[PDB]
């Protein structure tokens, strides 16, 4: 009954290849970015790469390409999913309305046989007769790219080259030929053939198999006039055409492995090649000329263009720019010049894009102390390896700032009666004021005749009848805009200094301690109308007009001292209408009568960091349905502003959140800003739509965008990371990472490049000799490489490496735990290591090493020998629980500061993962899925409780409950198993029975509980996970009623939410393993649930047709297009 | 939007073990070929008169190569 809800918390980023051509129009230059199951369509212009349309398909994409099947003006897009569902797609733009029209679709899988080890490879004939694919062993599938082949009928050609490396359609031949690199008894060769779908045969043949570099893997088809193909290996490139070939072996490619290529020059003369180290190369084909006019190749040259991010895919776009896509790092657009720069490079970066993966590890720590935890992750690979910090703040867009400290208030004034915009900004300070004249974006200090700058100001602003007003501790000054000079002044009858004041259009309200006055504003007069006196001092005043009143509030908001209370009086006479108690020893600082959305509320901020909110009945002065929330530590000044349409308020505090109305409730979220003590809305000529947010140090002007909420800081390591943990003692993160050294002619390996682990403020190396006598690595092999692992001390605020501790050569750091152990109060970083060699399929030796993060040094505390490699470690009841090969071993930390083994368990194949909860241990395996162990302290040993009988290869695991284990496998599936405690026999009781099964299409690498939300107080829990594509998902538990509610909802939603290519949702959702395929069950596709809001109303009504959902009372309630939105919102606000 | 619309349809089909059963239990040779004794003037010179029969287990066989065993 372990039902779960699954959503994407962060959209996938990994550039799973790319496609370029003329998709959006015949003339446009297009680029499509592959994101697993999604595609983002862009057009490139002089200004950069701009988005066109975001689309999705129900399935992971294996093949994507553009073609023009003789007669089309636009390219058509062919897509084949990992489930073998093919389609032909046409881009359609009905003015502003953009979508994709499916012209053909159908499955192209072979029912009996076994798939190619190369995966699904699909290529298109340049003459566009057919698409050819290498799908099965010895099986090449060809599908006519016709207009009438709606079902995509496929034909099967038997291939002699059973095992191939890379197939591409060839140029320089009228026939639909393919040139490819393949493996046979003669080594690797390049060969060609003519595909024939009607004959189901391969005809010959541009050329015969010819010898290529043993490491050859890539084939480039070369456009006419050259024709032919280019073969690329590790150290050399060859060009083949008929019975002749050219060859070159540049040292610049020899040093790295080329991953991908892309044609630049349409005559087939120039190609871009790129590696995984970040080098981009230009391959130039130097042509000759024959007596018959034939174009042939004379030679091959490769130039190093410069450095880029990892070249997973290259798509040359325009008149110089190429997109460098990476699923192993960040992506970018670089221009290829002719004239070299000061570095000798021809690569000029234009734009860059961030990729939040592959995700290696994750941890969540609140480094801001806002209630919003930030996720610090290990991501990327090679030179693109980095740490990233993802924080959930609705981004602020800052336009200006000024260094004017000691501010105690700020108000924009319209000093020119004939202008709409603000002319000046008035600032109040501890014991003075300033007035800044606004000149577009620039400002200057000015002086107004009616303005005071040698007194503290409580309030300043515009009032009715073209007037300015200022209230100081000394007096109330009414100023006319025309002269910008005083016309009337009011003075306290009690001869006391003003302690509270506020102004509005038709009047002001002031107080001196207890005494309270109502003064009306006339064209040139301040007229006292009425006054009273409070039992206790006034803490705050607000008489902002409510409803449609002519600048006059019928109500007066009063905060009070001593008793700690706020009340509503009828302003004209100060008659009590309503009162509320606020607290004990805490005084209110800000009381408002204002609006959210279109409704009226009363607010009250107290000097304990908490706020009150009340519904406000403006006609009667009554409050109802009050709320209390905690924002920060400061009394907070609450201020009203208008947003994109309706109004909201902002918390001017140490925790600068914005408060808005949602589901008939006032809710809030933190803004990505340091601190605010005072706020006012700004509408000037330079800043026509912004807020001026000021604190006691500086003033900043900007907008709360409410567009971006998740902000990512990237901190490059230039080395692949491995693990991350946090220690509260050193106020730092512990990070494991791996840098690469390579072998040259003498002395073994040496650093290939600089990285964070060597570019440290401090460093050290392990001195352990424990496995000295047993370490005999291949340090005498030219071109070979070694991983060098380090434990880093990372500053929690700066994320610089404060210390880098290197492990022994060929010592891997596989696991990291942050905890205190045994009776030792100190929190330590525990690193699980292993001795790993090229000859050892399985490790025999490793160790558990405990370190202390002390300032700029990493101090070794303990070094425990283990038998096998320590692959995983977790905290377990004050003890260190570690997985060493197949054996799970529990270690006790003694007062001697060293580990000793208490007990173990090894009834498994390999103990791939560890997670703990109390005395329960979840062990992941390679072919046993999830196993459950428990510690039995009464025996001092382990007991096997249950196992999943299904031999799943786990990619990651997590514990959902004592009898419930959630995890994901290498088959790109998610599942949850439950121990059958209700069972009758042991076969059943000891079985962790699959309850739910769901396919993600994503390979989950990391699990951790928690989410990037701001904590201010349908589904329960929050298991977060990261995948190899930068995707971050979130899984929460469901009740029986909500599972069925959402289950019926999914069935309706998939009827109208059409995929690209008309590919059924039943394909992607189905749990797909090596042994069985099953439809999703026990899980909700929460992305489908959210997607409801992205369809037109008529289709929303189709979804809710006959849509009655079971409820906890047992009632079934029908739904309407608007009510099923409410359902989405109920889930949205939780996950 | 049509005068007539189908709501129910019960389709009917005949089921046979093709089973590459264009062959024989006692004879081997394809049922549409000559039944050994018709490949030459053995049982008959009239090779064109060699017929095919069906059984009760979703398959066929030559008439001659099976009925010849009735005497046995």
């Amino acid at each position: 009954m372990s039902y779960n809800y699954v959503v994407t918390a962060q959209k996938p980023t990994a550039v799973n290849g790319c496609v370029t051509g003329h998709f959006t129009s015949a003339e446009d230059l297009n680029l499509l970015i592959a994101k697993n199951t999604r595609l983002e369509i862009y057009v490139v212009t002089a200004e950069g790469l701009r988005p066109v349309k975001e689309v999705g398909m129900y399935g992971k994409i294996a093949v994507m390409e553009l073609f023009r099947p003789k007669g089309e003006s636009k390219d058509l897009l062919f897509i084949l999913t990992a489930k073998y569902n093919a389609c032909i797609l046409e881009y359609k733009q009905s003015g502003e309305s953009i979508d994709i029209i499916t012209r053909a679709h159908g499955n192209v899988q072979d029912r009996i046989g076994r798939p190619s080890e190369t995966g699904i490879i699909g290529i298109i004939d340049p003459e566009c007769r057919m698409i050819g694919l290498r799908l099965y062993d010895g099986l090449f599938k060809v599908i006519p790219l016709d207009r009438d082949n709606k079902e995509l009928k496929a034909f099967n050609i038997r291939l002699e080259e059973l095992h191939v490396i890379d197939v591409k359609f060839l140029y320089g031949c009228q026939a639909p030929t393919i040139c490819f690199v393949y493996q046979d008894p003669q080594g690797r060769h390049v060969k060609t053939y003519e595909v024939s779908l009607r004959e189901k045969e391969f005809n010959k043949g541009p050329w015969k198999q010819e010898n290529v570099e043993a490491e050859a893997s890539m084939v480039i088809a070369v456009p006419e006039p050259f024709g032919g193909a280019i073969i690329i290996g590790q150290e050399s490139i060859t060009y083949h055409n008929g019975d002749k070939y050219l060859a070159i072996a540049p040292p610049i490619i020899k040093q790295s492995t080329i991953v991908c290529h892309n044609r630049v020059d349409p005559n087939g003369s120039r190609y871009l090649l790129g590696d995984m180290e970040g080098r981009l190369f230009m391959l130039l084909l130097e042509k000759e000329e024959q007596m018959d006019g034939t174009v042939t190749l004379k030679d091959l040259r490769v130039e190093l263009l410069g450095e880029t991010s990892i070249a997973e895919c290259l798509t040359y776009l325009d008149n110089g720019v190429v997109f460098v896509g990476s699923r192993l790092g960040d992506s970018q657009l670089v221009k290829l010049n002719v004239d070299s720069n000061e570095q000798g490079s021809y690569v000029v970066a234009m734009e860059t894009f961030t990729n939040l993966g592959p995700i290696v590890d994750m941890c969540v720590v609140d480094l801001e102390r806002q209630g919003q935890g930030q996720l610090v992750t290990c991501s990327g690979a090679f030179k693109e390896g980095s740490l990233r910090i993802i924080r959930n703040g609705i981004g602020i867009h800052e336009h200006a700032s000024i260094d004017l400290p000691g501010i105690k208030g700020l108000w924009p004034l319209r000093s020119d009666p004939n202008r709409e915009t603000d002319d000046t900004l008035v600032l109040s300070f501890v014991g003075q004021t300033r007035v800044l004249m606004l000149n577009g974006e620039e400002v200057e200090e000015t002086e107004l005749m009616g303005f005071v700058d040698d007194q503290q100001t409580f309030f300043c602003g515009n009032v009715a009848h073209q007037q300015l007003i200022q209230i100081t501790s000394a007096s109330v000054r009414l100023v006319s805009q025309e002269p910008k000079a005083l016309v009337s002044e009011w003075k306290e009858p009690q001869a006391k200094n003003i302690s509270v004041a506020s102004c509005n259009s038709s009047q002001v309200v002031v107080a001196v301690g207890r005494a309270l006055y109502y003064l009306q504003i006339h064209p040139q007069e301040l007229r006292q109308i009425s006054h009273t006196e409070m039992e206790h001092e006034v803490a705050c005043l607000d008489i902002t007009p409510l409803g449609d009143s002519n600048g006059l509030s019928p109500l007066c908001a009063i905060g009070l001292w001593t008793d700690i209370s706020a009340r509503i009086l009828k302003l004209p006479s100060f008659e009590l209408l309503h009162k509320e108690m606020l607290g004990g020893e805490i005084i209110p600082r800000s009381i408002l009568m204002t609006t959210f959305e279109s409704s009226h509320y009363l607010l009250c901020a107290l000097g304990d960091g908490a706020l009150f909110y009340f519904g406000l009945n403006i006609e009667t002065g009554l409050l109802s349905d009050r709320k209390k929330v905690t924002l920060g530590t400061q009394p907070t000044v609450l201020r009203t502003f208008r947003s994109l349409s309706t109004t909201n308020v902002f918390a001017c505090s140490d925790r600068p959140t914005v408060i808005y109305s949602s589901n008939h409730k006032l809710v809030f979220s933190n803004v990505n800003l340091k601190e605010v003590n005072y706020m006012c809305p700004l509408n000037s000529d330079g800043y026509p739509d912004s807020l001026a947010l000021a604190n006691n140090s500086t003033l900043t002007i900007g907008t709360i965008d409410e567009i971006q909420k998740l902000h990512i800081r990237t901190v490059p390591l230039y080395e692949s990371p491995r693990k991350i943990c946090y220690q509260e003692v050193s106020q730092c993160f512990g990070v494991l990472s791996s840098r690469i050294e390579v072998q040259d002619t003498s002395g073994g390996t040496t650093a290939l490049r600089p990285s964070a682990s060597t570019q440290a403020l401090s460093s050290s190396v392990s001195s352990s000799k424990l496995f000295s006598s047993s370490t005999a690595p291949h340090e005498t092999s030219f071109g070979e490489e070694v991983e060098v692992h380090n434990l880093l001390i990372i500053d929690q605020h700066t994320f610089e490496v404060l210390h880098a501790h290197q492990f022994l050569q060929n010592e891997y750091a596989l696991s990291l735990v942050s905890c205190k152990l045994g009776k030792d109060p100190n929190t330590y970083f525990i690193v699980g290591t292993a001795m790993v060699y090229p000859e050892e399929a399985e490790p025999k030796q490793g160790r558990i090493v405990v370190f202390q993060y002390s300032d700029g040094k990493l101090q070794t505390v303990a070094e425990k020998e283990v038998k096998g490699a320590v692959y995983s470690m977790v905290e377990f009841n004050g003890k260190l629980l570690a997985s060493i090969n197949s054996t799970v071993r529990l270690y006790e930390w003694t007062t001697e500061k060293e580990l000793r083994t208490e007990c173990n368990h090894y009834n498994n194949i390999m103990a791939l993962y560890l997670k703990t909860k109390g005395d329960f241990i979840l062990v992941g395996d390679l072919m046993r899925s999830v196993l459950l162990l428990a510690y039995k302290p009464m025996e001092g040993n382990f007991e096997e409780i249950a196992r999943d009988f299904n031999p799943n290869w786990m990619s990651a695991v997590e514990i959902l409950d004592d009898d419930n284990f959630l995890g994901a496998e290498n088959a790109f599936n998610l599942f949850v198993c439950q121990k059958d405690s209700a069972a009758t026999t042991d076969e059943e009781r000891q079985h962790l029975q699959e309850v739910g099964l769901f396919h993600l299409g994503e390979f989950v690498n990391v699990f951790c509980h928690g989410s990037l939300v701001m904590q201010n107080l349908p589904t329960q829990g929050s298991v977060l996970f990261g995948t190899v594509n930068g995707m971050i998902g979130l899984v929460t538990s469901l009740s029986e009623s909500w599972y069925n509610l959402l289950l019926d909802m999914q069935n309706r939603l998939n009827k109208v939410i059409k995929s690209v290519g008309k590919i059924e949702h039943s394909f992607w959702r189905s749990f797909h393993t090596e042994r069985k395929t099953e439809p999703a069950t026990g899980f909700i596709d929460g992305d489908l649930i959210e997607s409801f809001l992205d369809i037109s109303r008529p289709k929303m009504q189709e979804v809710v047709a006959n849509l009655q959902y079971d409820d906890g009372s047992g009632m079934k309630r029908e739904a309407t297009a608007d009510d099923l939105i409410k359902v989405v919102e109920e889930l949205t606000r939780i996950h | 939007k049509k005068r007539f619309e189908v709501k129910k349809w019960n389709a009917v089909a005949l089921w046979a073990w093709d089973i590459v059963v264009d062959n024989c239990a006692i004879c081997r040779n394809h049922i549409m070929d000559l039944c050994i004794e018709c490949q030459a003037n053995q049982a008959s010179a009239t090779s064109e008169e060699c017929t095919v029969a069906w059984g009760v287990c979703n398959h066929a066989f030559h008439f001659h190569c099976i009925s010849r065993w009735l005497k046995t």
């Binding site: 039943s1066 | 049509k2 007539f4 189908v6 019960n10 389709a11 009917v12 089909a13 005949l14």
Partner: protein, 165 residues
Amino acid sequence: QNQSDSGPIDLTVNILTMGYWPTYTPMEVHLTPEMIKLQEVFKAFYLGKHSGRKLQWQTTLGHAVLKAEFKEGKKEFQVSLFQTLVLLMFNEGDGFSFEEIKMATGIEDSELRRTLQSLACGKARVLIKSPKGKEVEDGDKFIFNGEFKHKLFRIKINQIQMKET
């Protein structure tokens, strides 16, 4: 149901052992595209469980429930597959000859004569034959019985498919 959606036709299949049932003559007829897709899928389903087989569809044996819109409302009839094709051919318009229907439905004349002999001559007529009589000729013109007065749903008009000839 796992194909993501389904057609308007609530399809079932009768699978007959050739060694038990009478031999029947099949006809390739102009089935609604939805019927073609669905019977092909059902064929695919059967032969994915019991492979190495072929299924010979008998369009003469199949039957359907067809709803017709009259001046008195939309009523259902129990019709043969061939009667269904004959009647469905009149859902765009009428005034068609026998010969035209034969070509339009793709069935034999003998089969069409029986379908029209019931549909346009018997009780609860769906079609009206202009040359009033019991037998059906090539030149006979048929129109839709808009003036259909009846209270029963799923009226049996397919006696010909359960009666000897």
